[PDB]
Amino acid sequence: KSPNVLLQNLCCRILGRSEADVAQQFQYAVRVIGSNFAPTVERDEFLVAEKIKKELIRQRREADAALFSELHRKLHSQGVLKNKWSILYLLLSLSEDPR
């Protein structure tokens, strides 16, 4: 593979369509992901864990905030993810408030 065609996989996964049916959305993916491959901001998994707990208190899913205390431990227990920080920031970024 390469990450450019792997992003095309992501564009097949979010949408429900073939890749010859739409080429606009993959062009939005390559325009935003492109000319950037490396984070230029603070790197720490510990701070984003303390930002996920702080977010789950704000949504009153405070029992799910003690679940994340176990799920981050399970994430450490497998230990086969190279950057734990990028997916935690990514999952933090798409957060919805259903309350």
Partner 1 sequence: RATNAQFDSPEILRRLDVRLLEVSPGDTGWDVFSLDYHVDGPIATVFTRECMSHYLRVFNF
Partner 2 sequence: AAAAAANLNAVRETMDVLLEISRILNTGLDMETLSICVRLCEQGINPEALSSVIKELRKATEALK
47 contacts partner 1 (rule: CB under 8 A): yes
CB–CB of 45/88 below 8 Å? yes
By CB under 8 A, which span of 7-15, 25-33, 68-76, 88-96 interacts with partner 1?
88-96
CB–CB of 49/89 below 8 Å? no
Give the binding site for partner 2 (CB under 8 A).
Answer: 3, 6-7, 9-11, 13-17, 22, 24-25, 28-29, 32-33, 36-39, 41, 52, 55-56, 61, 64, 67-68, 71-72, 74-75, 78, 80-83, 86-98
